[PDB]
PDB file of C-alpha atoms and ligand atoms in Angstrom:
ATOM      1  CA  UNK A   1     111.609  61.519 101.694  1.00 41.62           C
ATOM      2  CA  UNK A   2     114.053  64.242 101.853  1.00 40.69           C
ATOM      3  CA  UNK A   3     112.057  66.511  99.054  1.00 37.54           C
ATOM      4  CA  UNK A   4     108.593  66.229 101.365  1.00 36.00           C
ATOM      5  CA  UNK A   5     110.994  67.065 104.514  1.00 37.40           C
ATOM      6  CA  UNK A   6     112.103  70.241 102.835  1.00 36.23           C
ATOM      7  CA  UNK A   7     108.462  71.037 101.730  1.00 39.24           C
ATOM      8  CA  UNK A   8     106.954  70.449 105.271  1.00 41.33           C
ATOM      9  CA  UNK A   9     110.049  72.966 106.932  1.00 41.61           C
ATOM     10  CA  UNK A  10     109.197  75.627 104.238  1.00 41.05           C
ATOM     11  CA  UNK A  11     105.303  75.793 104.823  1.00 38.54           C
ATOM     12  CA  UNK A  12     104.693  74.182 108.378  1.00 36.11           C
ATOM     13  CA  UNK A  13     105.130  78.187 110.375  1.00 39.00           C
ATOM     14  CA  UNK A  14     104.325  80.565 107.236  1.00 36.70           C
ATOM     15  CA  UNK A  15     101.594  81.825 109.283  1.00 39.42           C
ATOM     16  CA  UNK A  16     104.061  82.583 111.862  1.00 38.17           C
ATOM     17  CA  UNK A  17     105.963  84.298 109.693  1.00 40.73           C
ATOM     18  CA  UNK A  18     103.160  86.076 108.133  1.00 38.86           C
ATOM     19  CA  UNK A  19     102.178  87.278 111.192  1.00 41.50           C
ATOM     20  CA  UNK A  20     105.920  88.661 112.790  1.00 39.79           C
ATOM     21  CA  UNK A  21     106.350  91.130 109.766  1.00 40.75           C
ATOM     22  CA  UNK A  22     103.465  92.814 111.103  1.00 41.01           C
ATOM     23  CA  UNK A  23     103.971  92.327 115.052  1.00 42.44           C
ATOM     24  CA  UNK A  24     106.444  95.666 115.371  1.00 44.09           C
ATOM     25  CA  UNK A  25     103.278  97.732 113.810  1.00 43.11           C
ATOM     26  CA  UNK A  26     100.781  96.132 115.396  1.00 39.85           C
ATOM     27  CA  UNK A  27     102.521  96.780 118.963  1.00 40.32           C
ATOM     28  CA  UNK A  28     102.992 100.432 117.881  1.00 42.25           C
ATOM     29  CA  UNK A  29      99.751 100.717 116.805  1.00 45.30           C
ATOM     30  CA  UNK A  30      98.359  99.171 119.890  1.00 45.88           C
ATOM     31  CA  UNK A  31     100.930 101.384 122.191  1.00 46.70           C
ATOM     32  CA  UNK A  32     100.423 104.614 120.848  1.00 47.50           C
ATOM     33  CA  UNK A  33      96.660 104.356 120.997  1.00 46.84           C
ATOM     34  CA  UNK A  34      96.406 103.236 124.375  1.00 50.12           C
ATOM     35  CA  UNK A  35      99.845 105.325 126.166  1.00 47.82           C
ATOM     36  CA  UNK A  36      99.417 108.328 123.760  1.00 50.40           C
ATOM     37  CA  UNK A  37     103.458 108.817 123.641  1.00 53.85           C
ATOM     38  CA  UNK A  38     105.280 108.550 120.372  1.00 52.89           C
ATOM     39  CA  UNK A  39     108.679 108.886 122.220  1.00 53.48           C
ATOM     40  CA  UNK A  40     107.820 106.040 125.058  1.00 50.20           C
ATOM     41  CA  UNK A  41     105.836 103.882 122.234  1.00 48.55           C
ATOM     42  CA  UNK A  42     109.165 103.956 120.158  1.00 50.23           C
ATOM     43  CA  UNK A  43     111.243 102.621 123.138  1.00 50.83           C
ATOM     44  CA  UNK A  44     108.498 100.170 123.787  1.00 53.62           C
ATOM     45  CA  UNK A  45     108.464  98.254 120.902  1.00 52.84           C
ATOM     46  CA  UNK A  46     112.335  98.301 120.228  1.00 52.93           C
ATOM     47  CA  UNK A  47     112.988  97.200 123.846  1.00 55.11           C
ATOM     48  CA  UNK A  48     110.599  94.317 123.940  1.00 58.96           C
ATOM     49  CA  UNK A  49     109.583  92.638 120.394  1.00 58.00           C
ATOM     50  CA  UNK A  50     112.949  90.266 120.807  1.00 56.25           C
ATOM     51  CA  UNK A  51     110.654  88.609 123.270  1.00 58.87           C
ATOM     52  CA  UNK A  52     107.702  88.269 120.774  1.00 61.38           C
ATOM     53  CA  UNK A  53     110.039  86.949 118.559  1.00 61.65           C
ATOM     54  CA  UNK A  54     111.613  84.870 120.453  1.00 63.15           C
ATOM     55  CA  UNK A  55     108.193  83.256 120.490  1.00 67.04           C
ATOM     56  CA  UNK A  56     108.218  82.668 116.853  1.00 71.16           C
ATOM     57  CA  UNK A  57     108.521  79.087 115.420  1.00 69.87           C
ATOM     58  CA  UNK A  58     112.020  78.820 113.922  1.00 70.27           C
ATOM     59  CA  UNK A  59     113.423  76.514 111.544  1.00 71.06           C
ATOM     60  CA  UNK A  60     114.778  74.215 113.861  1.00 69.00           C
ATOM     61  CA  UNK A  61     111.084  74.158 115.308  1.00 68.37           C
ATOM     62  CA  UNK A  62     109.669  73.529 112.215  1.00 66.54           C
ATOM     63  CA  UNK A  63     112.221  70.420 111.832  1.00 67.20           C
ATOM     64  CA  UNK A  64     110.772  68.855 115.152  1.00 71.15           C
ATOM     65  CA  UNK A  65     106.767  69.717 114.223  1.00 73.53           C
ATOM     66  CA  UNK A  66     107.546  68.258 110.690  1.00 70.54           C
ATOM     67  CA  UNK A  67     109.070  65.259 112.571  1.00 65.24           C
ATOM     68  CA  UNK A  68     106.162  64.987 114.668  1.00 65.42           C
ATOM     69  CA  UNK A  69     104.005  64.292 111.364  1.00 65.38           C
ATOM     70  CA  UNK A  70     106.411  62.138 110.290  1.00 62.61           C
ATOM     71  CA  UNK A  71     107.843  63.809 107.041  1.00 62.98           C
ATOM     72  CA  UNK A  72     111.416  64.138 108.630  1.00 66.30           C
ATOM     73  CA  UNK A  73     113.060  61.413 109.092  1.00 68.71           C
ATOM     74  CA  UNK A  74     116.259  62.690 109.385  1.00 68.54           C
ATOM     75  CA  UNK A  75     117.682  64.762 112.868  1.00 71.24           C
ATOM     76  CA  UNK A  76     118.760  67.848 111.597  1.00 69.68           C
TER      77      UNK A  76
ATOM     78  CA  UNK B   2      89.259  62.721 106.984  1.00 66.32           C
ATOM     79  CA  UNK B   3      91.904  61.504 110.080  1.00 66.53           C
ATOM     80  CA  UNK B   4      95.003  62.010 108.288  1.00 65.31           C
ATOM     81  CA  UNK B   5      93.508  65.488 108.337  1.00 63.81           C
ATOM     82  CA  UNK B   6      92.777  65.645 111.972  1.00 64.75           C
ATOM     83  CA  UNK B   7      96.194  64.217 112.614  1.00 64.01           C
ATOM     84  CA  UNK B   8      98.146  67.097 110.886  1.00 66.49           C
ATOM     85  CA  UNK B   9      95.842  69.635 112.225  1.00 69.36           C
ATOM     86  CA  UNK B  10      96.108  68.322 116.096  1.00 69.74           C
ATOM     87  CA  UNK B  11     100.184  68.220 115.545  1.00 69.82           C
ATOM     88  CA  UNK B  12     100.356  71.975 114.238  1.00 70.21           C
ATOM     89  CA  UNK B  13      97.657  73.146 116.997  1.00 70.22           C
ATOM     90  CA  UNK B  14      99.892  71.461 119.780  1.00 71.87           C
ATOM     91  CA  UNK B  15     103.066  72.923 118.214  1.00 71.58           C
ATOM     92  CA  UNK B  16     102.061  76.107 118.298  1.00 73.45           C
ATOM     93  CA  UNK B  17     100.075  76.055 121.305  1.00 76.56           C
ATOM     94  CA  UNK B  18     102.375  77.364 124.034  1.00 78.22           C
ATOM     95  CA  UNK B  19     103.308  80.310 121.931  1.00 75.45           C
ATOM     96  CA  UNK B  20      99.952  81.285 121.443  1.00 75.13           C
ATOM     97  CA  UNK B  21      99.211  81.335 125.017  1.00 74.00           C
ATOM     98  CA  UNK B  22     102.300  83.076 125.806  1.00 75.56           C
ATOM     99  CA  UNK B  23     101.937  85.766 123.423  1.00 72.15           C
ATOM    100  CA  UNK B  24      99.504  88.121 125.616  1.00 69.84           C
ATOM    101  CA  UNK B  25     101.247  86.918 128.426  1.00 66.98           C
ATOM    102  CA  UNK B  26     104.738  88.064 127.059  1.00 71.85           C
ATOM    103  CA  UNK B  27     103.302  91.547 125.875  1.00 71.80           C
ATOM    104  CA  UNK B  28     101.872  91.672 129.566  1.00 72.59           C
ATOM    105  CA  UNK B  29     104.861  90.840 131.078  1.00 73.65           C
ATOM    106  CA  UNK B  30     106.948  93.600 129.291  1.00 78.05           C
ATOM    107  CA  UNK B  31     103.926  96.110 129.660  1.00 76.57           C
ATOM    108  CA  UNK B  32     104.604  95.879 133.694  1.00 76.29           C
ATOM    109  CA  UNK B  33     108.738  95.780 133.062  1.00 76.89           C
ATOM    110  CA  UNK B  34     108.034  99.468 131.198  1.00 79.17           C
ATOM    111  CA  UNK B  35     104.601 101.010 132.338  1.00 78.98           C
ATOM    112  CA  UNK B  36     104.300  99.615 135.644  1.00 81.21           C
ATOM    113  CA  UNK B  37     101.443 100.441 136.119  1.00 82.99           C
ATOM    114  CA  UNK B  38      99.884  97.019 136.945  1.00 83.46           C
ATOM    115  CA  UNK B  39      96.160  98.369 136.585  1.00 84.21           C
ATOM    116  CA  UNK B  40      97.058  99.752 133.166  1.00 81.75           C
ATOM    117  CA  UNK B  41      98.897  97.056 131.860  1.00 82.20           C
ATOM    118  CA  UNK B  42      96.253  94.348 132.358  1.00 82.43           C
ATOM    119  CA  UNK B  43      93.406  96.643 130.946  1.00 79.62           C
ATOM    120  CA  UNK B  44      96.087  97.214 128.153  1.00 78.75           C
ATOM    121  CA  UNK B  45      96.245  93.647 127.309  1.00 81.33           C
ATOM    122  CA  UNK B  46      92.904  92.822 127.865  1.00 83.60           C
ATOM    123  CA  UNK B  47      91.308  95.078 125.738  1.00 83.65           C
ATOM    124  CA  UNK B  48      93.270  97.121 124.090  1.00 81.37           C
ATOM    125  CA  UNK B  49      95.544  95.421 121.548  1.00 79.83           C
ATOM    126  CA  UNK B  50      94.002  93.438 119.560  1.00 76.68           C
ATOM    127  CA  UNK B  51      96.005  94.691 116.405  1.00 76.07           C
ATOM    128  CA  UNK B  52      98.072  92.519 118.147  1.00 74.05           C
ATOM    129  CA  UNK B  53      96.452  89.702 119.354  1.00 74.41           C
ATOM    130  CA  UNK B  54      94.853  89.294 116.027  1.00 74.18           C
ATOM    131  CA  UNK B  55      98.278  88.046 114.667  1.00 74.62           C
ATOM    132  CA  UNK B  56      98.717  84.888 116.282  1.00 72.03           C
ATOM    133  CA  UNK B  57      97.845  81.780 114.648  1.00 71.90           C
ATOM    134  CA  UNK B  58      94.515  79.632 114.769  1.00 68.96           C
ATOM    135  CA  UNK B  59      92.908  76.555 113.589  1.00 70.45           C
ATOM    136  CA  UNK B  60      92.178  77.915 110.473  1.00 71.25           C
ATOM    137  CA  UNK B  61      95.610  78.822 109.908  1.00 73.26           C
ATOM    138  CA  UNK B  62      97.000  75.189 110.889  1.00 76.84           C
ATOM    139  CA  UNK B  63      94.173  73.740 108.083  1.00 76.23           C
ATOM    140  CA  UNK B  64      95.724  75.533 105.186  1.00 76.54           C
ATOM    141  CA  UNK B  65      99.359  74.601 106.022  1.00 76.93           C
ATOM    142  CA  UNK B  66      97.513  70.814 105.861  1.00 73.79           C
ATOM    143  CA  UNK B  67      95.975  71.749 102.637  1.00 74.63           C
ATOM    144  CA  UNK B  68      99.073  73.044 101.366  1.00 75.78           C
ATOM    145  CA  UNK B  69     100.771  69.505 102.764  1.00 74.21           C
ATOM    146  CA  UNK B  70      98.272  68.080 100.657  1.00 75.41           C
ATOM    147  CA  UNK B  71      96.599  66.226 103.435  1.00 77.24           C
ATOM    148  CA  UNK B  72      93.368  68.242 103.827  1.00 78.89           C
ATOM    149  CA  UNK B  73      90.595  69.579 102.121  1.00 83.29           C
ATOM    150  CA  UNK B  74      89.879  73.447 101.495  1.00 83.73           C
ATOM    151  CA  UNK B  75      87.763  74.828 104.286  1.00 85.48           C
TER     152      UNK B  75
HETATM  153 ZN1   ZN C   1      86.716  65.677 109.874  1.00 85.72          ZN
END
């Protein structure tokens, strides 16, 4: 049904998006530690999380997985 | 419990190739800034794992399953 479609897109990547909050801290925390430069550490992480979150399950993602178990009928 | 395994087995293939590619990504961008290729690898291997500890597991796809009301608690 529609209702179990909507249920599967809202819970199928939580723990993706659990887990992003805490990626731009966690790549700080990991930078500064290991490269010792607050100043470079800052660029790092501004200048490259788009590609960790580019790696993050989005709705449309969720749509297809929730598809795959067959909840979603519909396309889109 | 195969309705279980089912749901499990989709979520685990879903997220599979983002899993992989999150170390690789970070390593990736480590050698676009550093450079430094020896650094970056021993920065990847072993020294983020504030980071690495963040991506999604088994575990995690056997809650959503439990939540879809399709498996068991662990
Ligand atoms: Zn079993």
């Amino acid at each position: 049904s529609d209702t179990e479609c909507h249920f599967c897109k809202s819970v199928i990547n939580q723990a993706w998006n659990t887990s992003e909050q805490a990626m731009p801290q966690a790549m700080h925390q990991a930078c500064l530690r290991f490269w010792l430069d607050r100043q470079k550490c800052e660029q790092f992480v501004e200048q490259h999380m788009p590609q960790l979150l580019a790696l993050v399950p989005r709705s449309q993602d969720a749509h297809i997985t929730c598809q795959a178990l067959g909840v979603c009928e519909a396309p889109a």
